[PDB]
A paper describes a structure:
The simplest TCSs comprise a sensory histidine kinase (HK) and a response regulator (RR) component. To address this question we have used the TCS DesK-DesR from B. subtilis as a model. We had previously shown that the HK DesK, a member of the HisKA_3 family, undergoes important conformational changes to switch between phosphatase- and phosphotransfer-competent states. We now report the crystal structures of the DesKC:DesR complex, trapped in the phosphatase and the phosphotransferase functional states.
HK activation leads to autophosphorylation and subsequent switching to its phosphotransferase state. Upon auto-phosphorylation DesKC adopts a strongly asymmetric conformation able to transfer the phosphoryl group to DesR, its downstream RR partner. Comparing the conformation of the phosphorylatable histidine between HKs performing auto-phosphorylation, and the phosphotransferase complex (this study), the His residue shows ~180° flipping of its imidazole side chain. During auto-phosphorylation, HisNδ1 has been observed to H-bond with the ultra-conserved acidic His + 1 residue, which corresponds to Asp189(HK) in DesK. Once phosphorylated, the His disrupts its contact with this neighbor carboxylate group, stabilizing the P~HK species and leading to His χ−2 dihedral angle flipping. Subsequent re-protonation of His188Nδ1, triggered by RR binding, is consistent with P-N bond weakening, as a first step towards phosphotransfer.
Residue numbers in the entry:
A (entry chain A): 154 to 328, 335 to 368
B (entry chain B): 165 to 260, 262 to 269, 273 to 301, 304 to 353, 355 to 357, 361 to 369
Write the structure that this text describes.
């Protein structure tokens, strides 16, 4: 009634705690990978730059040689990092749009999309969740529907980004990606609804603004 | 089970995106700076050596600090030293012997390092002497117990050697840590968890 509160909050608290443990586990895993790559390179840079400083007067040529070495190892280390950052990032929704056009065309399914109410600003996290859901919704159309047409709408409506994926095929079986998407969306305080009357239509919403 | 699995995967992902931004900014920037300054510094070796030296002291500082955090996160991590020794002994046994191990978390860095040293020596002895063709690491009550068994033949004489040898070395080091070493029919080493 009003204890429903005390409870929802103990729930909030435990979720947060579980949260920081998983979070930390990941942070450490990454810290080990970084030490394992960049570690020796950074130490080397330090050493050589120190040695080089020592040789400025004594052996200018040897110092320049050393600084060339420093330059190379800093360059390549910077690469390791660019790669990692890119890898750790996600898929932009505009890029996923292009992937699904290619996939639907390759499957001989008509793709209907017109940009309307494109989100003004969405968090990179929520954008990446939506990209993942959009990919799966279309994988399902291709694998199961036997559709000839697929309609995708991506709109900012009220305080949500709403994606609808509809097809004119037939829904297969009775009550995996559907639970996967719903769980991912619900974790983001979003929702997933499915209508299987005239083919299959997925409505996925996630908060924004 | 997945219910909790896949949610935790979502938290990791988020975390992963966050670290990604942080890296980009801090470390990516520090490496670019290092490159720049080291290049400028090279340019000044002859024309302005004093400047070149200052630049180089700076590069030194930014390289040293560059992984501080990472270094810290890994510095306070328990399980690693022994987890790395596990990898070394797999390599050594393969280069020599079938290795049988199945994962079975909390100790002290000191006691972990003592165990790594003993594990290395136990396996060096297997490789050098046994002519063998199994390692257990378990947290039992308030001890960490490591067993290293082999299917070769024991080569030791009536006496259990002395100074300059690993068996006495391991026993002495373990016993000083309030641990134990027992041993040849067909090594059990224990150390207290926190002390
Ligand atoms: N667009 C669509 N059209 C027709 N049937 C669909 C559909 N999307 C899903 N289905 C039906 O719902 C079922 C469950 O879908 P879901 O995505 O969860 O698993 P799946 O069969 O695609 C394997 P996975 O998702 O692990 O790749 C499918 O097996 C299919 O019968
Ligand atoms: N796993 C094993 N299998 C067979 N014999 C072993 C063995 N471990 C030890 N031994 C025997 O016990 C003896 C004493 O071992 P110990 O480790 O103390 O010295 P060592 O011969 O390895 C030189 P050091 O230990 O200084 O490197 C060995 O010389 C060998 O005969
Ligand atoms: Mg599916
Ligand atoms: Mg020995």
């Amino acid at each position: 009634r009003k204890e429903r509160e005390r409870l929802e909050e103990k729930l909030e608290d435990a979720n947060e705690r579980i949260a920081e443990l998983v979070k930390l586990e990941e942070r450490q895993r990454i810290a080990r990978d970084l030490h394992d790559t960049l570690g020796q390179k950074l130490s080397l840079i330090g050493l050589k730059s120190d040695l080089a400083r020592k040789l400025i007067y004594k052996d200018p040529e040897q110092a320049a040689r050393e600084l060339k070495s420093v330059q190379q190892t800093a360059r390549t280390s910077l690469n390791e990092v660019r790669k990692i950052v890119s890898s750790m990032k996600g898929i932009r929704l505009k890029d996923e749009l292009i992937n699904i056009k290619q996939i639907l065309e390759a499957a001989d399914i008509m793709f209907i999309y017109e940009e309307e109410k494109w989100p003004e600003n969405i968090s990179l996290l929520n954008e990446n969740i939506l990209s993942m859901c959009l990919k799966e919704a279309v994988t399902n159309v291709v694998k199961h529907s036997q559709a000839k047409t697929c309609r995708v709408d991506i709109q900012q409506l009220w305080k949500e980004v709403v994606i609808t994926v509809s097809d004119d095929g037939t829904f297969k079986g009775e009550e995996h990606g559907l639970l996967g998407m719903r769980e991912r969306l619900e974790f983001a305080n979003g929702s997933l609804h499915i209508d299987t009357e005239n083919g299959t239509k997925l409505t996925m919403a996630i908060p924004n603004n």
